[PDB]
Scaffold this motif. Structure first.
Motif, PDB file in Angstrom:
ATOM      1  N   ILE E  29       0.824  -1.202   0.000  1.00 33.15           N
ATOM      2  CA  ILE E  29       0.000   0.000   0.000  1.00 33.15           C
ATOM      3  C   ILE E  29       0.862   1.257   0.000  1.00 33.15           C
ATOM      4  CG2 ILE E  29      -1.722   1.256   1.343  1.00 33.15           C
ATOM      5  CD1 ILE E  29      -2.905  -1.420   2.098  1.00 33.15           C
ATOM      6  N   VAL E  30       1.939   1.269   0.789  1.00 30.45           N
ATOM      7  CA  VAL E  30       2.827   2.430   0.835  1.00 30.45           C
ATOM      8  C   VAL E  30       3.553   2.605  -0.496  1.00 30.45           C
ATOM      9  CG1 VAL E  30       4.966   3.275   1.909  1.00 30.45           C
ATOM     10  CG2 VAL E  30       3.061   2.508   3.333  1.00 30.45           C
ATOM     11  N   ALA E  33       1.133   4.103  -3.225  1.00 27.80           N
ATOM     12  CA  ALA E  33       0.991   5.553  -3.172  1.00 27.80           C
ATOM     13  C   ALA E  33       2.250   6.251  -3.673  1.00 27.80           C
ATOM     14  CB  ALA E  33       0.655   5.998  -1.751  1.00 27.80           C
ATOM     15  N   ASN E  42      -2.937  11.755  -7.062  1.00 26.58           N
ATOM     16  CA  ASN E  42      -3.016  11.908  -5.604  1.00 26.58           C
ATOM     17  C   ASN E  42      -3.810  13.166  -5.254  1.00 26.58           C
ATOM     18  OD1 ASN E  42      -1.781   9.654  -4.336  1.00 26.58           O
ATOM     19  ND2 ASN E  42       0.218  10.410  -4.997  1.00 26.58           N
ATOM     20  N   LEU E  43      -5.040  13.179  -5.729  1.00 23.96           N
ATOM     21  CA  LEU E  43      -6.086  14.117  -5.368  1.00 23.96           C
ATOM     22  C   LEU E  43      -7.056  13.426  -4.413  1.00 23.96           C
ATOM     23  CD1 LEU E  43      -6.501  15.708  -8.919  1.00 23.96           C
ATOM     24  CD2 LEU E  43      -4.967  16.318  -7.025  1.00 23.96           C
ATOM     25  N   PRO E  44      -7.686  14.170  -3.484  1.00 28.51           N
ATOM     26  CA  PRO E  44      -8.341  13.547  -2.319  1.00 28.51           C
ATOM     27  C   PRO E  44      -9.378  12.494  -2.667  1.00 28.51           C
ATOM     28  CG  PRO E  44      -8.435  15.966  -2.201  1.00 28.51           C
ATOM     29  CD  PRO E  44      -7.557  15.633  -3.340  1.00 28.51           C
ATOM     30  N   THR E  45      -9.407  11.433  -1.854  1.00 25.73           N
ATOM     31  CA  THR E  45     -10.221  10.252  -2.162  1.00 25.73           C
ATOM     32  C   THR E  45     -11.715  10.527  -2.100  1.00 25.73           C
ATOM     33  OG1 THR E  45      -9.899   9.581   0.138  1.00 25.73           O
ATOM     34  CG2 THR E  45      -8.481   8.561  -1.554  1.00 25.73           C
ATOM     35  N   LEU E  46     -12.134  11.533  -1.336  1.00 30.72           N
ATOM     36  CA  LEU E  46     -13.533  11.927  -1.368  1.00 30.72           C
ATOM     37  C   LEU E  46     -13.829  12.774  -2.600  1.00 30.72           C
ATOM     38  CD1 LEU E  46     -14.735  12.733   2.258  1.00 30.72           C
ATOM     39  CD2 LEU E  46     -14.767  10.591   0.997  1.00 30.72           C
ATOM     40  N   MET E  47     -13.177  13.930  -2.710  1.00 29.32           N
ATOM     41  CA  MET E  47     -13.280  14.775  -3.896  1.00 29.32           C
ATOM     42  C   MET E  47     -11.885  15.212  -4.334  1.00 29.32           C
ATOM     43  SD  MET E  47     -16.314  17.111  -2.325  1.00 29.32           S
ATOM     44  CE  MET E  47     -14.964  17.700  -1.306  1.00 29.32           C
TER      45      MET E  47
END
Lengths: 46, 907, 50, 97, 47, 30, 12, 49, 7, 288, 55
Positions: E29-30, E33, E42-47
């Motif tokens: 996982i590390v 990313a 790497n834009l936020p997982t919600l929005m």
């Protein structure tokens, strides 16, 4: 030691979640306010 | 005359002509059309009898005309909006008239008593009580929520006295709260219904009248006054009628919903009978942000054994409209850990303006939303809720977070107020937090003035709740038939005020075992052992207790012990029924309107019988009108301060706290330190501009041409003045407000004072401290105008006269550590710096520095502390005391260095 | 720090203030200079002389 | 029982005014001027007469304040004994048996 | 004073667990990313 | 029928009986 | 006299 | 600055002080004891109610 | 004080 | 009595003065306020005959996310659009499209429902025979040819959605199979089985209160990942709480050797609300 | 006596440790990344008024 580190872990997840909550508030407000800034207008003297 | 645009409003507040049902005085609205059509005295009137007719006719006028467009057509839309609120104010004038004389003639409902002991005679006779054998038509549509409640029909007004319920376990305290959020439901509906009729967009079955009710409180009775809908053609329950047709169209779909939770869950399918009904209910559910059926018909939150009437929407035949009744479950409840609290309700501002996720109705209402709400603002706070209880847990945790990180730092950075009883109960309510969550704010408050304001507010509330527990006992026993009720009412006041604030042992013992435990079991903070009475013994607690109990005292409470060029105010501490207020002087007639009319009808044809109480009136003016919304949304797009830049917003997040959200707010953005003359000192320290923070707007487009050729006041100023002006006129023609009327004028005069305009702020101030009462710190704020108004236009001598009056006024009504005192001292030091006295600015500016560290932000500095230390350092620089100037400026450097909430310009 | 100045002023309202010296080497290790800048020279339950 | 407030007053320690005789008669008699101007008969039996037991003469001729002028009126007999001593009456007492 | 040489440019590092003491699932996982920052989503997982 | 108070039937209930927090007040009921 | 407070609280 | 969680480590500090401040707030007729306690250190201890 | 008495 | 207006005109100067908007506002300033209202108020506000055609049956589309999945006690919506027999779409919106939802399990259809529609007057006779669990999806008509359905059907079953045009003929590839399953886990209906509800083990061997998670209505949830706060008030110590990831949870308690006569109870509970049988009181297993 | 913590299974105590430390590395990497957007907006000069040159 595994149990002491385990109860350590949910508190660290909870504290990291609170810092995520602060970051989502700042990111949302900065993105919304970064269209309403008044652009400056400059004109020559002569 | 100049002053006319605010004076004519306040004079209209002082003359609100008391009307019976048949009386129609005026040539403007309902009085110019419906006059002399439905006459008759009280004997023949009872049923229908205008009121509901007059109010709904004016509501029909405002909806008909706003459909019409045009500049001349919308000018006349402006009149009918004030004529509608004038008509609502006619209802409230008779609401205070009927209910006050109800308490005197029929104490606690039942006549008997030692008063009118002698067919019931007098004005008591005109009151007709309804049991379910007397007028069964009235008992159906207007049934008391609990059993001890009595319902009286006078003119066309249903007066439901609140007395709890003995058998079922409902105290009179809890019953007043369930009647309170029943009102809050009808106020919630009144804005949405007005908007639904207002927009074009969406014999019409459901017609949705304006829901009107007033909660008048004279000595803890909670009289609910409502108009009488026409009951001669006994109203059809639209709830039964809609589902009876639905049971004859889809009989099996109704039964499947019945096994689900109830037969009223099938009402989500009312398009099959009428397209109009279903889409109208879709708008109500969208605006109030509630799932499914907007009103809680089939499901309730209170237990079923306690017979509490559910939501009904009775429609009559005479005028063919359905009125909303018993909306005590419309708002979503607050759930703490899984135990549901049905007395507590979340506010309008939180449901429809903070938590954009829709909220369920009660709890047992089944949750029904098919994963369409994935991520939005506040993003459900994860944890993926599965039923209605978990979503209300998400909502209550959101309200805890909003009162923690979004209300505390906004108040801490001045902004709102939170200073004097009322506007503390208003700052909570309009930001979206219930007043019962103040215990959480006490633990997080750091500054001393905000901690003492919340502590005073909780203690003033708690003495009110002991007052309601004592009258629970006085109605539990039948003592109102033995002793005379008026002096028993008065002797509870003087006994309570002496037992809470005094200089004896029996007031310290009363605090230790009854008053502080009352704070703990309501506001939820254990303050036993810390809030010893010699911390808040100042008569600020007396003033907050004065407002929240509905009792008024005379000006003979506040004497003074001057010893040479001072006042040194004090209060005597024998309290007697003689010290209670008799409503004769010009200052307190405008607290019990029509004292001379209520005098003449309960005496003789029926001095120490009116003394004390005044009715606290809580009317239902819809917050969706044209005047209301225009001033509101101008106040959000033109805020007082948006700070110097956006990089300081990121700095406050760095090694700091979250961000503050402030909401639109019309009145109460007041005080000094925001846009007074200390807003200029604040703007110079923080690095921003004081009038209209980002600019000084005078045009409508950036014009290079105009600036090249250039090489009556602000548009925000004239707009917010002219919107708050008609905002003042609307609320004064409503009347029935008193304290928040003065809050409109003091907010208005602070804004007039902001953009010059000294003379209008002078005249608006002198009206406040000569005619309006003394129930808040409204007379403290009214003279607080005068010292700022003179400061702009020189007038140094009237400054000194005004200063020596309010120094003993503020040491006495706020203690020796005051926010108003510290800002006043900073203004005196600023004026002394401008006129170059140089010396005699160090002694006032030092008192700013010794106070500002403790009163606001004890975690380090403030803009008041930085402005104080800069004024001391500048003055000692030019008086050649150069060594002492080194300490003063370097101490400002060390303190302000490692501290947020101060920009880079300060450090 | 102004956090400790405000806390000291609220406690010693009406008391008397004396200037005094304390040896840091003889001070216990938990009252190291970094912790003094945070808490404000915490007093052990046995008291501390001045 | 009529002067029941002053009986429980004598259990208190009181406060000694730091002023002269002229300083004394200056301050309560400045007090009573504007307590009279505020009006009301409630103050009239409380402080408007009870503070008038303060003469502005150190000398008093003995034919008044004699040991036999405490015969015409017994109210000042109780006032000069019950810690009034020549220098608030609003607390009622429930008159039950 | 002080010429703008390349060794005086400020350099930023970051706390990261040693990738030999981590379990292989957190290592995956590390590392995922750290490859996703070259790919730029790497834009936020919600929005 | 209060009588005596037996030790064995005295119960301890709470959320912080087995978990702790350093520097913050921890509450449980008996 | 604040002990007469406490003793009277024991009494009626 | 000992290792993980102060668990299984007994120095002088776990021997002489080991005093969490505790108090009880029994009411005037309920059957419920409100017990509160706080301690300065992390670790692993036995509470004898 | 006489004026209050005959007021 | 002939006054009317000549007593109404004298009364609107005393007790009825009525400050209007024109009275309070100067004429120049009134155009500024009313001009501002434009943006701040109410932001939302016999040639011949030709033919008539109906929707066919087989050509009507039934696309929708609810016809493939459902959500616990919540909407399951799919959109049916009426299609002309040649292929073009009827943008008029006059076609009833009833939806009957049949959870797949004489042996239980209707009884009472068939006597209601023995006639069902023959121009529009009912064709679907009503089951033990048909749940009528609603037939919201949008007025443009599209029709949204809303249905509700609890059980852990492979449900068959039936679509009928004018309640006569089947539409599309009906019946459509939806895999309606158990949903979100709540409290209440969760049930505990094993020997831990009853006699425990002396000597601290172990005991076991295996619980089964349940949704809001009857079904057994078999997706692990939730948390159950299990209180151990008394002389009981919860050893393990392990997720079996098939719906069952695996919770121990042990009584110490020498403390078996004490008061022991277990208080398994979800978020705030307990489960069936809590505050469980086990009794000593062996004699004495 | 035997403590309740010392007689548990080593498998579940350790497995809950590795899954929770996995969540710790989840939240840390999210904290790294939202601070990357924070330092982006501050330092890329997008929170500054742009300039227009009118004659």
């Amino acid at each position: 030691q595994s149990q002491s580190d385990l109860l350590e872990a949910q508190k660290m997840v909870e504290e990291q979640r609170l810092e995520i909550q602060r970051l989502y508030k700042v990111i949302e407000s900065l993105n919304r306010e970064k269209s309403l800034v008044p652009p400056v207008v400059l004109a020559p003297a002569n | 005359r100049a002053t006319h645009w605010w004076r004519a409003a306040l004079e209209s507040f002082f003359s609100m002509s008391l009307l019976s049902s048949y009386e129609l005085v005026g040539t403007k609205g309902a009085a110019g059309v419906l006059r002399g059509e439905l006459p008759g005295p009280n004997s023949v009137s009872l049923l229908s009898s205008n009121w509901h007719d007059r109010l709904q006719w004016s509501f029909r006028q405002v909806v008909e005309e706003a459909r019409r467009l045009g500049i001349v057509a919308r000018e006349k839309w402006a009149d009918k909006e004030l004529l509608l609120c004038k008509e609502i104010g006619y209802f409230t004038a008779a609401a205070r008239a009927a209910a006050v004389v109800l308490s005197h003639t029929h104490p606690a409902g039942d006549f008997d008593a030692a008063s009118n002991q002698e067919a019931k005679p007098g004005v008591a006779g005109c009151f007709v009580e309804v049991k379910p054998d007397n007028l069964p038509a009235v008992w159906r549509v207007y049934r008391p929520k609990f059993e001890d409640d009595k319902v009286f029909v006078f003119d066309s007004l249903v007066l439901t006295v609140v007395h709890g319920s003995r058998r079922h376990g409902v105290s009179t305290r809890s019953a007043r709260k369930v009647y309170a959020n029943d009102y809050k439901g009808r106020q919630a509906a009144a804005s949405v219904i007005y908007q639904m009729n207002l927009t074009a967009d969406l014999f019409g079955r459901t017609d949705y009248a304006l829901p009107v009710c007033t909660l008048v409180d004279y000595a803890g009775q909670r009289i609910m006054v409502e108009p009488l809908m026409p009951i001669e053609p006994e109203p059809v329950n639209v709830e039964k009628e809609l589902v009876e047709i639905l049971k004859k169209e889809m009989p099996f779909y109704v039964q499947q919903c019945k096994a689900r939770g109830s037969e009223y869950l099938a009402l989500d399918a009312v398009d099959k009978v009428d397209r109009k009904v279903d889409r109208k209910m879709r708008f109500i559910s969208k605006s109030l942000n509630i799932f499914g059926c907007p009103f809680p018909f089939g499901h309730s939150d209170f237990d079923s054994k306690c017979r509490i009437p559910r939501a009904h929407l009775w429609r009559s035949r005479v005028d063919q409209l359905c009125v909303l009744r018993n909306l005590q479950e419309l708002l979503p409840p607050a759930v703490i850990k899984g135990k549901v609290h049905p007395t507590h309700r979340m506010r309008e501002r939180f449901v429809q303006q903070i938590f954009d996720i829709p909220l369920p109705s009660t709890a047992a209402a089944p949750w029904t939303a098919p994963k369409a709400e994935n991520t939005i603002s506040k993003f459900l706070q994860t944890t993926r809720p599965g039923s209605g209880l978990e979503l209300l847990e998400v909502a209550h945790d959101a309200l805890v977070e909003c009162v923690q990180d979004d209300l505390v730092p906004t108040i801490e950075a001045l902004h709102v107020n939170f200073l004097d009883s009322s506007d503390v109960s208003h700052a909570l309510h309009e930001q979206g937090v219930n007043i019962k969550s103040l215990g959480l704010m006490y633990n997080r408050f750091a500054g001393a003035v905000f901690r003492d304001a919340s502590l005073r507010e909780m203690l003033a509330r708690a003495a009110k709740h002991l007052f309601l527990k004592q009258m629970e006992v006085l109605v539990r026993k039948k003592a109102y038939r033995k002793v005379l009720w008026v002096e028993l009412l008065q002797t509870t006041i003087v006994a309570l005020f002496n037992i809470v604030l005094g200089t004896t042992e029996e007031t310290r013992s009363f605090w230790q075992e009854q008053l502080l435990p009352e704070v703990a079991e309501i506001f939820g903070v254990d303050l036993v052992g810390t809030v010893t009475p010699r911390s808040v013994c100042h008569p600020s607690l007396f003033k907050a207790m004065e407002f929240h109990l509905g009792v008024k005292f005379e000006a003979t409470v506040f004497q003074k012990t001057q010893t040479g060029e001072n006042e040194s105010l004090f209060l005597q501490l024998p309290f007697t029924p003689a010290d209670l207020s008799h409503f004769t002087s010009i200052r307190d007639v405008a607290l019990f309107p029509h004292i001379d009319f209520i005098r003449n009808l309960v005496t003789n044809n029926t001095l120490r019988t009116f003394c004390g109480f005044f009715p606290q009136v809580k009317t239902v003016v819809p917050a969706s009108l044209g005047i209301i919304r225009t001033a509101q949304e101008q106040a959000e797009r033109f805020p007082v301060t948006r700070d110097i830049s956006l990089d300081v917003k990121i700095d406050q997040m760095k090694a700091g706290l979250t961000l503050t959200r402030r909401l639109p707010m019309v009145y109460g953005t007041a005080g000094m330190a925001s846009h007074g003359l200390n807003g200029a000192i604040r703007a110079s320290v923080l690095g921003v501009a004081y009038p209209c923070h980002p600019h000084c707007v005078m045009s409508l487009k950036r014009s290079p041409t105009l600036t090249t050729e250039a090489a009556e006041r602000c548009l925000i100023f004239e707009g917010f003045r002219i919107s708050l002006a008609l905002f003042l006129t609307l609320h004064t023609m409503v009347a029935s407000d008193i304290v928040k009327i003065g809050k409109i004028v003091t907010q208005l005069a602070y804004v007039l004072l902001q953009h010059g305009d000294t003379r209008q702020a002078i005249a608006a101030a002198e009206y406040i401290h000569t005619r309006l009462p003394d129930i808040g710190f409204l007379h403290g704020d009214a003279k607080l105008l005068q010292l700022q108004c003179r400061a702009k236009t020189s007038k140094l001598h009237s400054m000194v006269q005004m200063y020596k009056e309010l120094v003993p006024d503020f040491l006495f009504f706020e203690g020796p550590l005051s926010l108003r005192l510290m800002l006043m001292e900073l203004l005196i030091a600023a004026v002394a710096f401008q006129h170059k006295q140089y010396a005699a600015a160090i002694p006032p500016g030092l008192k700013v520095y010794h106070a500002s560290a403790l009163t606001v932000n004890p975690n380090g500095c403030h803009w008041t502390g930085v402005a104080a230390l800069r004024l001391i350092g500048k003055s000692l620089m030019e008086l050649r005391r150069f060594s002492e100037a080194i300490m003063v400026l370097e101490d400002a450097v060390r303190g302000g260095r490692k501290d947020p909430s101060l920009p880079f310009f300060v450090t | 720090t102004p956090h400790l100045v405000s806390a000291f002023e609220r406690r010693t309202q009406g008391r008397l203030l004396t200037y005094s010296f304390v040896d840091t080497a003889s001070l216990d290790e938990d009252n190291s200079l970094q912790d003094i800048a945070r808490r404000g020279l915490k007093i052990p339950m046995t008291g501390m002389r001045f | 029982f009529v002067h029941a407030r002053d009986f429980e007053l004598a259990i208190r320690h009181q406060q000694v005014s730091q002023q002269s005789h002229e300083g004394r008669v200056c301050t309560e008699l400045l007090q009573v001027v504007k307590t009279a101007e505020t009006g009301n008969a409630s103050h009239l039996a409380g402080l408007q007469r009870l503070s008038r037991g303060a003469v502005i003469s150190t000398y008093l001729d003995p034919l008044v304040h004699s040991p036999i002028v405490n015969m015409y009126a017994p109210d000042e007999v109780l006032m000069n004994f019950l810690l009034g001593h020549t220098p608030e009456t609003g607390e009622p007492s429930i008159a039950g048996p | 004073p002080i010429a703008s040489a390349v060794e005086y440019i400020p350099t930023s590092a970051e706390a990261a667990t040693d990738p030999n003491a981590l379990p292989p699932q957190t290592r995956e996982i590390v590392a995922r990313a750290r490859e996703a920052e070259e790919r730029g989503e790497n834009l936020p997982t919600l929005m | 029928g209060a009588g005596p108070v037996d030790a064995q039937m005295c119960v301890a209930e709470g959320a912080n009986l087995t978990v702790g927090h350093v520097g913050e007040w921890n509450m449980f009921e008996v | 006299d604040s002990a007469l407070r406490r003793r009277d609280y024991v009494a009626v | 600055l000992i290792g993980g969680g102060r668990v299984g480590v007994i120095t002088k500090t776990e021997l002489t002080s080991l005093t969490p401040e505790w108090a009880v707030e029994k009411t005037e007729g309920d059957c419920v004891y409100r017990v509160k306690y706080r301690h300065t250190r992390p670790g692993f201890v036995l509470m004898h109610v | 004080v006489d004026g209050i008495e005959r007021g | 009595e002939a006054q009317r207006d000549r007593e109404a005109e004298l009364e609107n100067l005393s007790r009825a003065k009525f400050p209007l908007v024109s009275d309070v506002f100067s004429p120049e300033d009134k155009a500024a306020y009313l001009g501002m209202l434009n943006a701040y108020g109410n932001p939302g506000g016999r040639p011949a005959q030709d033919l008539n055609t109906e929707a066919a049956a087989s050509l009507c589309r039934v696309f929708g996310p609810g016809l493939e999945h459902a959500e616990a006690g919540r909407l399951a919506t799919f959109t049916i659009q009426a299609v002309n027999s040649d292929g073009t779409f009827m943008r008029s919106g006059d076609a009833s499209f009833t939806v009957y939802v049949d959870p797949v399990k004489e042996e239980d259809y209707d009884s009472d429902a068939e006597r209601l529609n023995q006639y069902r007057p023959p121009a529009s006779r009912a064709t679907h025979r009503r089951r033990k669990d048909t749940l009528d999806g609603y037939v919201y008509n949008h007025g443009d040819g599209t029709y949204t359905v809303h249905y509700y059907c609890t059980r852990a079953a492979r449900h068959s959605i039936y679509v009928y045009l004018n309640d006569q003929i089947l539409v599309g590839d009906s019946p459509y199979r939806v895999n309606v399953t158990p949903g979100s886990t709540d409290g209440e209906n969760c049930e505990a089985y094993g020997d831990g509800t009853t006699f425990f083990a002396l000597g601290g061997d172990f005991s076991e209160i295996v619980i089964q998670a349940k949704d809001a209505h009857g079904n057994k949830v078999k997706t692990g990942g939730d948390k159950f706060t299990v209180a151990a008030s008394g002389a009981a110590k919860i050893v393990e709480i392990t997720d079996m990831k098939d719906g069952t949870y695996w919770v121990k308690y042990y009584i110490p050797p020498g403390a078996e006569r004490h008061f022991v109870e277990i208080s398994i509970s979800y978020h705030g609300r307990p489960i069936k049988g809590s505050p469980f009181r086990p009794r000593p297993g062996g004699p004495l | 006596q035997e403590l309740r913590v010392s007689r548990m299974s080593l498998m579940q105590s350790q497995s809950d440790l590795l899954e929770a430390q996995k969540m710790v590395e989840e939240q840390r990497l999210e904290i790294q990344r939202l601070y990357k957007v924070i330092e982006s907006l501050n330092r890329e000069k997008s929170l500054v008024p742009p300039v227009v040159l009118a004659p």
